[PDB]
Amino acid sequence: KAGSFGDLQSRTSTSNDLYANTNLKLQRPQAGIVHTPFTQAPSGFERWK
Amino acid sequence: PYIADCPNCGHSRCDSPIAIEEVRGDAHAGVIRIQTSAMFGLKTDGVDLAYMSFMNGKTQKSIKIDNLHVRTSAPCSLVSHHGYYILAQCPPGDTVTVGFHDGPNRHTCTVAHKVEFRPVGREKYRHPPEHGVELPCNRYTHKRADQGHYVEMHQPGLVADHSLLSIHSAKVKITVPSGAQVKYYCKCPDVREGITSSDHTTTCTDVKQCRAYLIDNKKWVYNSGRLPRGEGDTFKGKLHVPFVPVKAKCIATLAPEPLVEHKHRTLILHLHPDHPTLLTTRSLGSDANPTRQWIERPTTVNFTVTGEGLEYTWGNHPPKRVWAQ
Amino acid sequence: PYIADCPNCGHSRCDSPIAIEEVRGDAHAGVIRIQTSAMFGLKTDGVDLAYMSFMNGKTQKSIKIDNLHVRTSAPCSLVSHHGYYILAQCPPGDTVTVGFHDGPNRHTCTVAHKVEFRPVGREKYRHPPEHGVELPCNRYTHKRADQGHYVEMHQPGLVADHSLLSIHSAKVKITVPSGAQVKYYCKCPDVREGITSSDHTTTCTDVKQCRAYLIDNKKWVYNSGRLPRGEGDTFKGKLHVPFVPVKAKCIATLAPEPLVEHKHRTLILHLHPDHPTLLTTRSLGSDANPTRQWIERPTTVNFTVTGEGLEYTWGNHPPKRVWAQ
Amino acid sequence: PYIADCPNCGHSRCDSPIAIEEVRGDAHAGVIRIQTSAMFGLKTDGVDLAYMSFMNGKTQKSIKIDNLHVRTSAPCSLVSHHGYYILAQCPPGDTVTVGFHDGPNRHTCTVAHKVEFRPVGREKYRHPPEHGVELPCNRYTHKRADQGHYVEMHQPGLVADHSLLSIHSAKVKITVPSGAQVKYYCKCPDVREGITSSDHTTTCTDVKQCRAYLIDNKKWVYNSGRLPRGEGDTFKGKLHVPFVPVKAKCIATLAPEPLVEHKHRTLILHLHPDHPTLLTTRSLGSDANPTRQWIERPTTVNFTVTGEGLEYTWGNHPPKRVWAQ
């Protein structure tokens, strides 16, 4: 689960495939300006430390 | 540009022209409106807000702003100046610490004031982000075309200037700036008022027992607490404030989305914020049974949802709602 | 040197060439690796890492680095730059705040990012000391001869430049940088693609209703989120990262030694740390019965040691062991 | 001006002349007394405290102080320098971070030291205010005319200088500063002491296997831990300390007045401080029944006052007293 431990789950380091339940939800940029709202849980590897 | 007594002027209590009064860390946007006793802005006469007039001597010095520094716990960011008054984006700080650089000297001024910046929202950040929702903060303007309030600004009282009281080779010798009004006598008996050009002093001799005064009320001042009253009168000089507090919508906070987890009439919520977030709810029965808790540490929480519904407020993120039949 | 939209660029959202993306306060050594959209390093052509090329106009400005400033809650310390990317030793800070000084202007860029620096060890310092044990921290390199990863860096999309759209005395007049590819039409019907030298505009007149574009893909960019896509293709330009996270042994923490005190099968320990220290033990019976507590306040503690032994871990100071018969 | 090994000298452990030893954040007034290994003050010879002599090479450089910077979590304020030693008004900081600017280079030095500034008083401020009561703090002087203590300052030991060990076109060639005493031999067998003018080296060839030493004890040093002993003797050089800790009455703290509220033999006190204030009382019966609690959060409290009296201590505001019959 996103936020919980193992939000990112790669088999190994080389493994291009993985499982990323991060609850990554993009939001629209504000007031006619170029940027990318990415609303996301900081990792369950950030916590767990 | 008024001059007053700065409290911890580098060493200790000097008399800085940039003596800080009325610190206002009362808005939300990282901003403080400050009054120096110095009136930067245009010059003495007519040009260029971005120049710099403080008092050196009895006299102004209307020159360039080159190296202003407001600062606190960290160096602030200027926002705009107008009149005696500057707006600057600061972080929180136990104190406020201001200063320019004339060029020969640092010549700063510093003061105590409790500062914080809560953004408006149920998130208790320490600083405004780049993104998030906009919502109605309190904040000061960039601009000058401003009349929403005005503070009394009547005359200065006198000021000391013992550079005047020279010696006439045996007697203490007063002079005048430009024909200004010098209010004079000594502990001994001699001239008792002083409204004059350059006088001498028949009786006393010592500079340290005489009235070196400057009634120079050709230009009014701010009515600082660190001003001596102009005893004569409440002269005119009602004068605006530029930096009105306005209802700007700050670019503002947002807390990361929750992890909704189902149970039987129960919301488990593994939760993981960026900053301390005030969560709260309202069990919509006529039994309200609300809850409040600032959450900064990530926490799996629980909510006994009822049949009719509950609502859920992840910070200033909008309120959610839930059917738990 | 790419240019993007800085979020709180002194005043508010400007477009700084040093627009900060990918802040990484994820190491331990007081260090952050940052990417500016600006590519400092060598010049446009071939010389001297310690020079400074950002974008001014459509154009670079490959000149000296003279007065870089990364900063946070306090001013940081630069470590090294390579490419778009800088490493700098910072303290903790709610934000990150970057900026050089071209010389006429401050021209900085600032951003939100949660920063901390735990050193590796059971001591929770705020800062690396001069002494103590070395142990395996995570940290970025000084160097450039680095291939351990590479990020995609394909082309830029177009960019706006309304300095182009002049007026041909009645018609709106586009020009070109150097023969670059200007993608052009207006709301009215006129030339519809634009792959040209300096064109005019037969139909529309207003500058504010036309396509001032610069397809100038002679040099690729970083694939910032604050980039508009080059719609044509995923061009080549796989490009390394210098500042790989490496297994440096930081000069690291150490907590003051304990005061061992004997009792009957019991360790009284008057204890007095420098910083919050995670103490913990392991009663070596098959009954583990461990304990954990961060200690920052000096505290006399106790440990019911058993017959066979206990061990004791005063921070990253090595583990002790004890016979309590 | 001694030179020693700074611990985190911008990059890492350099050998700065301003190598910081004996940080003393032990006073109250926002002040720290520091010792650089550099001896700023007068020049090499005779003039102007406000000049700046550090070691560059084997040599001094007695020039202007132009851009000193002590700093911590924030930039400090210098107070005064004398000898090896500087006093500076700092805020709290996990570290201490010092540095001037020679002009070609930053050339700073930094160190760990736990710093705080409690003012004396039951108020736990973070910073000295402009107002409040004066009371007996501990603090260092501005001045130099000071003898209250003296630290041993005997000779330097030798120092390395491999700029000496040039090559005599096949042999490694030592020279001398000014006829100073160069202590010399190589791993091979050649001249074994070295008390000489510029020698050659018959036997060895490599610069990296020889004794480049400078017994240059014409001027003593501070007895830094980062000094190698002058093995010969405890030479003279007992030398004072300027910045004695003195019993200054700091301009000091004061907490806002309480709101006294009557009840039956009971003081309700709605209370609202500026900073954490240690309140405490003494029920004047032979039953003392005192209370202590730091109050930073505004709190309505209560006190069961007895018949004979109670006293009340709102911070370093003077003690009150109360008849509750």
From TrEMBL, chain A:
Location in the cell reads: Host cell membrane; Host cytoplasm; Host nucleus; Virion membrane
- What is the top-level taxon of the source organism? Viruses
Subunit structure, interactors included: The precursor of protein E3/E2 and E1 form a heterodimer shortly after synthesis.
The free-text function statement in the UniProt record for this protein reads: Provides the signal sequence for the translocation of the precursor of protein E3/E2 to the host endoplasmic reticulum. Furin-cleaved E3 remains associated with spike glycoprotein E1 and mediates pH protection of the latter during the transport via the secretory pathway. After virion release from the host cell, the assembly protein E3 is gradually released in the extracellular space.
Q: What is the protein name for this chain? A: Structural polyprotein
Q: Which residues of the full protein are shown?
A: 998 to 1046 of 1242
Automatic annotation (TrEMBL), chains B, C, D:
Choose one Gene Ontology CC annotation of this protein and give it.
host cell nucleus
Domain of life from the UniProt record:
Viruses
Any GO BP: fusion of virus membrane with host endosome membrane
Q: Which GO terms describe its molecular function?
A: RNA binding; serine-type endopeptidase activity; structural molecule activity
Give the keywords, sorted.
Capsid protein, Cleavage on pair of basic residues, Disulfide bond, Fusion of virus membrane with host endosomal membrane, Fusion of virus membrane with host membrane, Glycoprotein, Host cell membrane, Host cytoplasm, Host membrane, Host nucleus, Host-virus interaction, Hydrolase, Lipoprotein, Membrane, Palmitate, Protease, RNA-binding, Serine protease, T=4 icosahedral capsid protein, Transmembrane, Transmembrane helix, Viral attachment to host cell, Viral penetration into host cytoplasm, Virion, Virus entry into host cell
Q: Where in the cell is it found?
A: Host cell membrane; Host cytoplasm; Host nucleus; Virion membrane
General function of this protein: Provides the signal sequence for the translocation of the precursor of protein E3/E2 to the host endoplasmic reticulum. Furin-cleaved E3 remains associated with spike glycoprotein E1 and mediates pH protection of the latter during the transport via the secretory pathway. After virion release from the host cell, the assembly protein E3 is gradually released in the extracellular space.
- What assembly does the database describe for this protein? The precursor of protein E3/E2 and E1 form a heterodimer shortly after synthesis.
Q: What is this protein called?
A: Structural polyprotein
Q: Which organism is it from?
A: Eastern equine encephalitis virus (EEEV)
Whole sequence portion shown: 338 to 662 of 1242
